[PDB]
Amino acid sequence: TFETRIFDEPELEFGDHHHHQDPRLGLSEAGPLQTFLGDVIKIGVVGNSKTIEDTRKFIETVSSGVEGKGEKHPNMHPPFPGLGNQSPYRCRFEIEDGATAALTKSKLDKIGKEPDHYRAVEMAVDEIIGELQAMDDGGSRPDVAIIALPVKLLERVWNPNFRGMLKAKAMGLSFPIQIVWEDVIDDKVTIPQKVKESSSRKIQDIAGRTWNLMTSLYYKGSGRIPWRRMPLEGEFSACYVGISFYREADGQQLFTSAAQMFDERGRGFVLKGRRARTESRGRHPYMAREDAKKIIEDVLAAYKLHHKTLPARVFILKTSRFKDEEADGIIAALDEAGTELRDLVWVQESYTARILRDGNYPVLRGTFVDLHGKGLLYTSGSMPYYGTYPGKYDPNPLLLCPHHTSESTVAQLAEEIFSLTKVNWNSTQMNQRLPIPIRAARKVGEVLKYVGEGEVISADYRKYI
């Protein structure tokens, strides 16, 4: 009755043929998987003069000597080695004096005095994009821009989403951007919260923001990937697809979003979105028999352009079930092209059953329980490496339901999905719950909803993360 399994923690592959399970420690003693050819990554700043000055101060202070938080749990709050001789990225970050743009004080008051909600956001986005385009068209081009948001603009704009509208109009530029509030770069300043007024917000310490921001900046600037999931020995070649759904901007419709992922010929990884919008079909979170084929055709066409041959396995992940039609279209395309092995899995974070054990701390991360054809997987909980349970109440398990047309058993699928959790380049944490393809699909659909009709869509992942 209810046979259970416990999986080991997967290991990521870093540079120089080194593998570990901690992204922080594996970077600090082996470097990135792909090394940058060159020493300098150039950073541009756009915002207020105070924000530019404390951004420069923050960069210098972080580069010099910053250190961790506490003596308890040494494997959970590591110190930052700094951008010196023993930097984890083996490269240097510099800011040029010509790639810095300042917003005049005689315009933020114009933004703040408008009694309309949409127009102020629109013109602030217009000003920021105008300065960025003027910087890009010149000869002082940076590799990654930092948009530091002042508190005066933040009060008017945050209190229509701003991040989505800004990243939708910054798609034509040649460099990605990174939004930073005034709290992170400069201390002694606190931002008041939303409708729950006079409570403000709290952030991490100095040594976690540094790790996350520096990893994101390196990935956005260099273009190379820091780490990747270690392949096993003897597996078949496979490609991963992830599908999500998202509502309209203001109305009540539902579009679908997709992301694709596979492995390079040498030592690399490929993670992209698409180059087109998937239109509308109503208000149900379900695809059709025509929109399910085209994603499979694009996924199979992307693999042959790199490996010169079709893959032997296709892996599809979704949140809203495979009743009869999407599965029919996927199977039809898959048996039409070349492929013998297939997998269709529906994940849901809505089940009510849990597992209760004696003691104080909850169950271990990676525990798997088989309920007939369904799998209860705990990709959250206590970890021996960290030394505690990083949470408050209890882990929320995932329920895995494979479709009735699938090859692998549910244990191998659970192991594969458990392996694809620490490949999030936005964060350096070890307690991720969702697998990478659906997270990428949600991140793509977060900003794909604020792009107007007939505009451009980029397949680069650096413009969505």
């Binding site: 420690l25 009510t352 054990r357 104080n360 169950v363 271990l364 329980v369 209890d394």
Partner: protein, 389 residues
């Protein structure tokens, strides 16, 4: 500015070599790999016995796994192939300026495939006068699941369709009187666990025309809608099984304990064989240092759900709380109270709730069994972390 700390480290290593006296010698500008060549003097009368020295010097910071007794270092597999082809011994020397620390290690030049990850422990690997002749020597537990199995009565009656609308019978005084099992679904047949001649037609508008009989096959049917109707039957049977003991919270779909003419708890809990019985199910609270101003209450509750699996009907229990004002009169607002109560909790303070709800739910009509148990191979460490959660 790293050139100056490299030069300082090389000079300090040469000085440490010259203090005991071994005739160390540096190299030129385009040196790559070996940083120096050292001799063995042996207290005057020097002998031509050279070793190669590679220097790693630092200024501040900590090593990778500095645990006050040892740390570790990783090699780059280019220096390994470089050092494994030499015709003379190789030595790596670590120097730190902040605490003036010197350590040394020997690269194994005698095995087959190389081995990285040097484990440098202190005391025993100090580059001082203590270790010089050695330097010159080479020249399952268990758990339970939240589900609860159920077993049903062997007979149930499917006949005597009422031909009356489902609301009219309820608003008839027969409906809002004694036993309210007058359940018909989508104007369908009146099927229930008790015969209408003794249960319904005695106290509910119905027709005396038939006796009915079923082997509980209705429990399992391929159609989803009839399964949902059976779930509605099970929910109403559970509601009938607990008359004048608990009440129904519709906005949260929960069963909350009632203050039976007194606004304190009942403390039924679970016997637990040799153990005792305490459970503060109902509790009141005050604020502003005055007991007259009653703030809220803490009714226990659980959300039930009926599921079909392995041709069995399992009950899923979700513990929660209900807050009212004064007593048996619902609160106008509990937005932060439930979240604050949930925030301060543990996994230990959730298994006991399930156990006590199970022990209350059966014994003192449908029987409720015992929850299944599973065996876990790898146990949680749980040692030395007796705090927090």
């Amino acid at each position: 500015a790293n050139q100056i700390i490299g030069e300082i480290g090389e000079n300090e290593v040469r000085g440490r070599f010259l203090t005991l006296g071994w005739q160390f010698d540096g190299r030129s500008r385009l040196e790559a790999g070996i940083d120096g060549i050292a001799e063995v003097m042996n207290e005057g009368q020097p002998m031509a016995r050279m070793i190669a020295v590679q220097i790693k010097s630092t200024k501040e910071g900590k090593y990778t796994s500095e645990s006050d007794t040892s740390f570790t270092y990783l090699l780059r597999t280019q220096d390994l192939a470089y050092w494994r082809g030499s015709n003379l011994p190789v030595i790596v020397v670590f120097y730190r300026q902040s605490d003036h620390s010197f350590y040394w290690k020997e690269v194994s030049r005698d095995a087959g495939p190389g081995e990285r990850r040097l484990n440098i422990d202190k005391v025993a690997d100090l580059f001082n006068a203590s270790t010089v002749n050695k330097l010159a020597a080479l020249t399952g537990e268990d758990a339970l699941i939240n589900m609860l199995p159920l077993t049903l009565p062997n007979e149930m009656y499917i006949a005597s369709t009422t031909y009356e609308p489902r609301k009219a019978i309820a608003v008839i005084l027969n409906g809002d009187g004694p036993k309210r099992f007058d359940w018909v679904i989508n104007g369908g047949t009146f099927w229930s666990f008790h015969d209408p001649r003794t249960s319904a037609c005695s106290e509910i508008v119905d027709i005396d025309q038939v006796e009915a009989i079923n082997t509980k096959e209705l429990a399992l049917h391929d159609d989803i809608d009839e399964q949902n109707r059976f779930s509605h039957l099970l929910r109403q049977t559970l509601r009938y099984q607990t008359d004048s003991d608990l009440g129904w919270d519709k906005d949260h779909k929960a069963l909350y304990f009632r203050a039976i003419e007194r606004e304190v708890s009942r403390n039924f809990a679970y016997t637990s064989s040799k153990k005792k019985t305490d459970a503060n199910v109902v509790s009141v609270f005050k604020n502003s240092k005055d007991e007259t101003r009653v703030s809220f209450v803490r009714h226990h509750a659980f959300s039930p759900r009926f599921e079909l699996m392995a041709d069995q009907w399992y009950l899923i229990i979700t513990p929660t709380y209900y807050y009212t004002t004064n007593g048996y009169a619902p609160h106008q607002f509990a937005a932060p109270l439930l979240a604050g109560k949930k925030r301060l909790d543990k996994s230990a303070a959730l298994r006991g709730q399930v156990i006590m709800w199970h022990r209350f739910l059966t014994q003192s009509y449908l029987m409720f069994g015992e929850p299944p148990s599973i065996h876990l191979d790898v146990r949680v460490p749980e040692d030395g972390w007796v705090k927090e959660k």
